[PDB]
Amino acid sequence: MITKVTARNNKITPVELLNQKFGNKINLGNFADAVFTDAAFKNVAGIANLPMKAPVMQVLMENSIVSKYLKQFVPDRSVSFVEEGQKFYIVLEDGQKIEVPEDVNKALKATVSDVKHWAGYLTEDGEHVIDLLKPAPGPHFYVNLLIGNRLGFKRTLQTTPKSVVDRFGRGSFRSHAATQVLATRFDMRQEENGFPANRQFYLYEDGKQIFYSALIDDNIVEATSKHSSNRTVIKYKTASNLEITRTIFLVPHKKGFPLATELQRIEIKNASDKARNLSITYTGMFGTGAVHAIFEDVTYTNVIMQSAALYNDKGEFIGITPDYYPEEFKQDTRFVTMIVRNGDEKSFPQSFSTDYNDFVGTGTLEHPAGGSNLNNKLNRKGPGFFALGAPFTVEPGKTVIIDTFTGLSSSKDNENYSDAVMLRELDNLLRYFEKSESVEETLNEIINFHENYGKYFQFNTGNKLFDSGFNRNLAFQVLYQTFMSRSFGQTQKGYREIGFREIQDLFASMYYFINIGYQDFVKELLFEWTANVYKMGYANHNFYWVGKQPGLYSDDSLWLLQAYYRYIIYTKDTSVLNEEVPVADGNNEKRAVRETLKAIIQYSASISVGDHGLPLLDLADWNDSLKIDSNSIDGATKEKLYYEQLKKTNGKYGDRFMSDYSESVMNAFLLKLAIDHLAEIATLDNDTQLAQQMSELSKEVTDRIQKHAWKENFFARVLINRYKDGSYTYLGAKGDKLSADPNIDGVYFLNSFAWSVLSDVATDEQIAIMVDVIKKHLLTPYGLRLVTPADLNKIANDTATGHYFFGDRENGAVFKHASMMAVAALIKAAKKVKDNELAKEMARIAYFMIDLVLPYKNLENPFQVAGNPRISTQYINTDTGENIGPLLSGTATWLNLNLISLAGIEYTRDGISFNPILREEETQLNFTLKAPKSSYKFSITKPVGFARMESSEYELFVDGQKIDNTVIPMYTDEKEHIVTLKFK
Amino acid sequence: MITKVTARNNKITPVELLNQKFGNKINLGNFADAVFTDAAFKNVAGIANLPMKAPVMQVLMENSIVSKYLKQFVPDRSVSFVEEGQKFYIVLEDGQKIEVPEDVNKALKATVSDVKHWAGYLTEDGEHVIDLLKPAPGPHFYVNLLIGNRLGFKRTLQTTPKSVVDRFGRGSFRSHAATQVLATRFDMRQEENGFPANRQFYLYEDGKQIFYSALIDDNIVEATSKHSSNRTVIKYKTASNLEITRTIFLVPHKKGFPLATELQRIEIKNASDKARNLSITYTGMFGTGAVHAIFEDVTYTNVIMQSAALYNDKGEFIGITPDYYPEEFKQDTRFVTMIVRNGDEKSFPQSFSTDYNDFVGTGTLEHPAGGSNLNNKLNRKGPGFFALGAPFTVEPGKTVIIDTFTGLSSSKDNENYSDAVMLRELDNLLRYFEKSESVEETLNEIINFHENYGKYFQFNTGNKLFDSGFNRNLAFQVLYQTFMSRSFGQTQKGYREIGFREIQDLFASMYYFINIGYQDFVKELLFEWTANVYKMGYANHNFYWVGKQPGLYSDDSLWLLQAYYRYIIYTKDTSVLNEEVPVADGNNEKRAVRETLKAIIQYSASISVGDHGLPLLDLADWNDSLKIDSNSIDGATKEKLYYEQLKKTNGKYGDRFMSDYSESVMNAFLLKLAIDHLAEIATLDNDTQLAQQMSELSKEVTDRIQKHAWKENFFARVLINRYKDGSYTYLGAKGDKLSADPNIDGVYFLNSFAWSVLSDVATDEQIAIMVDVIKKHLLTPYGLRLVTPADLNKIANDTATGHYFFGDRENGAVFKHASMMAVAALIKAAKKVKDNELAKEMARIAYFMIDLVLPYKNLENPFQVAGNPRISTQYINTDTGENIGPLLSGTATWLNLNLISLAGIEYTRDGISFNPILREEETQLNFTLKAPKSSYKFSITKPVGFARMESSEYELFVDGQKIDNTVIPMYTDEKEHIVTLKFK
Ligand SMILES: [Cl-]
Ligand SMILES: [Cl-]
Ligand SMILES: [Cl-]
Ligand SMILES: [Cl-]
User: Fold this and answer.
1) What is the topology classification, in CATH, of domain A911-983?
2) Of all helices (H) and strands (E), which one includes residue B157?
3) Distance between CA A549 and CA A570 in Å, rounded?
4) With a CB-CB cutoff of 8 Å, which residues 49-68 of chain B face chain A?
5) A283 and chain B: CB distance < 8 Å anywhere?
6) CATH 1.50.10.10 describes domain B498-504+534-708
């Protein structure tokens, strides 16, 4: 009877149909756009020969002239617009070509004139200039991320403030953890991160609204947004020649300031020849302290608070704070204030409202009925809506500046906390920003800070989109992730703690922090992670103020050896091994770092191992889908069972924990690398016993991996020990019996390849075999997928039943973080494998994948690939090519490592092992590199084609002297050194 | 330095300041309104002599003419408007009285003209007629609640659909449990129950928007809403003489229909002299199946679904369904369809959109840029936004009808479930509603169903607001709560299961259901609760599909004896005692109801008792604040410990469980009543052994309560057993040492009084003493508070510190459910106490409290008392008098019981024990009463003053015969009997 047609099962698209109906009576070009004319999909209206994919028909339908014109043909007849000469015609299925009227011709010409820039463009400094009327490619594309600065102050990760701002300034603003200053919204749309009033304001004249910052109407003649490094600037021009500018940024911390302050400066220039008597109404919504009650008890969120007014020492109203009854919601105190600067005069708000219903009245948020006559009523309840009002006359050619300060003080940074602390810190803040120029000086301080931070590594290639993308945008994102991990963004809105394994972010950022004088901050972070390791060697899976989930995931601790290795090899600072750091078990116990590193290795190499001597998988490892063992145990449980086992069987600590649990081959590689790292650290520390022990153990673990985990054509991913009849014994290579694709024998995991190489286990021949498998079965037109299709229900039960349509997340996506770990392996191998043709191929795959993740390239075909042109996104949908959020991701961290590796930089025992791998079409590469006590300018030349030091002829010079040693010294002479490499 | 002034600490209000500057220069009347002119509160603008409190200055400020005029004086000068003759003047502090201009005079006259009806009015049938422009007293005031009908079908409480509708049709619509059909909103405002698009639509003419159902602009000349029993009707008239009517109701279930369907009929009449070519765009937002991911992973909610189109057998598009990938979200299937009826023609939508971004475009939801040219694009992602479009020409004087059907099919009502089941059920639904008249016939069926249901008891007094409020509105609410408990409303939006103790709702509703032929449904509910009792006698605290929380709260099982007693005494059906019902412990074990009732009593009278032989409190009882014992145990834990104790101490089952846990005196009263009830049931069942055992146990328990819980001037609330030195031994009477009010010796709990009387434990002298304490310390100007101030930290560290400002919830509110249980006690005692002056006083308190809870009285001073004039609300704030939500409450259930009790009806062994208690000022009371096999007309007359059968002279007649027996038979002769009572 009734039938159902899904979006995916719909037989044909509008553009396919347009081509069928017109493709051989007009030239449709390389791109076109079309819409079905009715809900049964039999006819289309389209337009030919666009420069890229873009929703042109949608914009044309918003135009009353074109819309009316089309209704003489649609819906019963299909039509296509076509431009010949500089005239537009409409075409019918029967062949009639009708020259469109003059007014339709103009509208069509204006609409197509700049399609190539509809998603905006990048400045030479990598800032995104966005048109406030144009459609968005996707919900992350027009988003900026802002951060404070708590360097030099306590608990930087846990206390730095953070904000998200879209092109209209929508979004939210948080202090520590998920403490909301301006309210988050948890609703149906990814596009809605915050309550809609946040950061927005209205202008009035003669009691009538003339402007709302989140509404572009016919009275707005220009409106653009510019996302830059740690600030957003939004500009509008009215038909009445008012020029409005909004600048939004977070205040860097200073002693005595509130823990979080977001500053929004509003400049209003009267570019007309007549004075105007205006007023502003500045609005927003404070976040609730009772976040869970938004779901459970909205009335509770209202009754537990009231609004309160703030007054300076002269008795003048300055703004609003939401006042809470319960003690648990009094440990933070929010505020909003405003100063109006009008010539000589400084003034504060003259009126306010604090009840959304009274403010909107019979109107809407875009056109509030009470917006021009604020009622000065302090609301007895929440929610903490606010509106602050002030009048000002602005003379011809003059500007009025309104500075707004929104924020929160907290017990997290103050003993003996009460709202009296907020009032003192707010006074400190307002005194600091009393002089108009202080706001611009602080903004310039922010700009200069991030510019200085980025100087660790700077590309100079003349592709300015690439150079700015790396030198500014990626450098900022890696700083952002060091402080914020994966805890905040446009669509990351729930409370998330710091995952132990996300020490990875420091792998890339540590060099940046060390080269602006913050080596001690890097050490602090290393020690903070180290305090989340237990005596036995497992780790809290997550931490924030304290740690939780002891040993729940099997990979976690192993990542810490990579962090220590990177730090110690770069700085030669072995003193960190002797730091006495709290053990995660508590009871006031401390242990030297060195002994904790040994314990990490002993847990995964000796105690928590399976029948083949490889680390147990436990609940899961890096891959949360590998819920292979349904009766897994965490580390606290394992520890108790382990001591009971040693007593029952007369064992000694360090003996294996006995079980039929499955083994993680990826953990085996992380462990082998960790052991190598500790061996090299011990050698640098002149600790001969530990170096010998670790070198021997590395050899042993390598032997176990080769004997038990190489399976025909790949390193397996999991070894399975509970089927003694042999029905299943491994997952992750040919013959595993677990493929869900009839055309593939085996399941193949990208990380088995990547980590076999990064750990220096895979032989050259094993690499060649695995790369062939990757080319055939893991490399898609959108990049390297994480794994091939598997049927894990044959061995396990519940991370089962699929949740995604093909292309999304676990159903076949390109996970860009994993893709970048594979690229790290491809680069490392391309530098050293003997076979130059294997090296060439691996480098081609590396650059292919980097090209699919570089954010600036999202502006090449933005309405297909979406993403965000200044900030990474997490995955590529393999059905559509769309880059899909969230923003913060291991992608950015490993992309940074990978581009520096391709430029040739690896830090080793004796200095910089220099071995660059350029693109085949590049003939030059130039960059600068900072070190703590020296600097370098690197220049690389080569012919077109693949070239690498392993197989190509070259000449290397340092400071004008031809040298044969490709390990460049780490200089300490406070000079700039010139490195020149010329391939023959 | 900076100072802070809270809403509550603000020294003086605007009206206080208006009175101070003008109160002896003009007569400000009984009511006035005022606003501060600026943020420092030094001056005011106000208006004199209003008929009630109302936000008049707010409405005046929305008026351009009045707002401009007031700027000649404000903010520097205070002003008051005043009306002399029928002309308006403005007064200044210096005495100047200024006749205001004529345009200002007109605006002022118009604004004040109908203030007394700004919150709407009630029709004679109790329906709330609401103006769509006027402000709301509070967020529950303009709300209606809708319900389906699953009587005659399986799992009624778990499967009946339900909806919330405000005056604009905003809100949400659910199937089983918290399954969302139309999306709920969990955001900052109590006013926002649903996604804003839900139920709303636009009209277009010549490509231009002319109407949006949720926007009243200058082109709307009339706009009202009428909330009635189980439907809402919203009417608009445009300046162009279009008349638009929306009717919203839930479809009663029929075999073959979807489990949930909400029908919205839209009627568009062209009351002009020229035909109009119009189109409609009908919108909404489907609820997500992944509710938790709205908070945790919004991107997930989008990617797991796509939109799909629906087509009838002729290939015509009919609507949209959101299609889900994961199996767990495929067990319900949602739909929306639409039919346009235009003269002879029936048509279906010609276009649709399913992407919110494409629909709104550069516009707003109120003015969407894509609303008149839907794109016919099926969205590959969620959220499930929908817009259905259709054109129609409407001739002069003619009407077009658009019927919309929104709903969900479910596996909860169908084996072998898939979306094919939805398509079949939708076809059945649309075939049923093919003929235009079927919609009106179903609506009339609903109206007639609720009118017939209410006939069990009908008041006929000189007050139609009271009569309709009881006979229609309260009767509906009690039905609603029988099906929905406390699980849904404007602000009740989380998932809530059925609380065991909320069997209370059936105490009132069972008589209504029995008198429309649904006695078997009442039995089924009794058996359903009985299956949530464990063998030992404790109960699951909550249940829905299955039960949970075994014995967590100590009072739960005892309420079931009141339900069985009411049922058995009314019907004489003792057969239910022999029903074999599953025990909550499972393992396919069943037990006869009789033995389960005995076990309930044994648990609280013998096993789970403390040192005084009274029931243990456990975690808490009816009162969730009595977390006195921090090491409490649930029933499963207690049962395991109990069997171990019987073995260690050589005991027998039925012996006391030994502990120092605290005892609940309220539970002792519930238990004593339960025992009396089982004794009487056993006597009716001719079970002499059980009757004698229960009568003896009642005597024993009464003696325990009198000996151990009467403490000088009150029955205590908790006995404390863990302080062997006597430091504390009770809570709830003089001398308990636990008061937090220096002026009160002791803590007093309203329920100690109420349940001591309802259980027939309190002596007349005890009642007199407790009523005195109540008058002095529990009776406020807003009614009976639940408890006096207590400092429980002295016995239970681990506490709270309070969470509310004074007046709200636990900090001193009038909890209206508890107030009604106390009124039930006051009525019971007033009928029987020997002292007529005590009876008179208690009846006065009873009617005082009833007057404060009757919903229709919320329209007397609505901007102060708020609430909802058709539906109860939960509490009264004792600082302001505001009635605060939520809507569903034990208030309605016990109000219904109390008003019937006051009218004189109590069912006893031999019939109807008739003993009415009228108001002193009443001289007559007439009502009708239905019984299963007879009916009654009751008439009572008396002179002014207090009269009751216990102490006043009267004559009682039945069918014309004077009688002395005040127990009227329950007749079975299918005749109407006339009962006449005349007090002398
Ligand atoms: Cl994000
Ligand atoms: Cl993996
Ligand atoms: Cl509610
Ligand atoms: Cl109580």
Assistant:
1) Maltose phosphorylase, domain 3 (2.60.420)
2) helix B156-159
3) 32
4) 55, 57-58, 61-62, 64, 67-68
5) no
6) yes
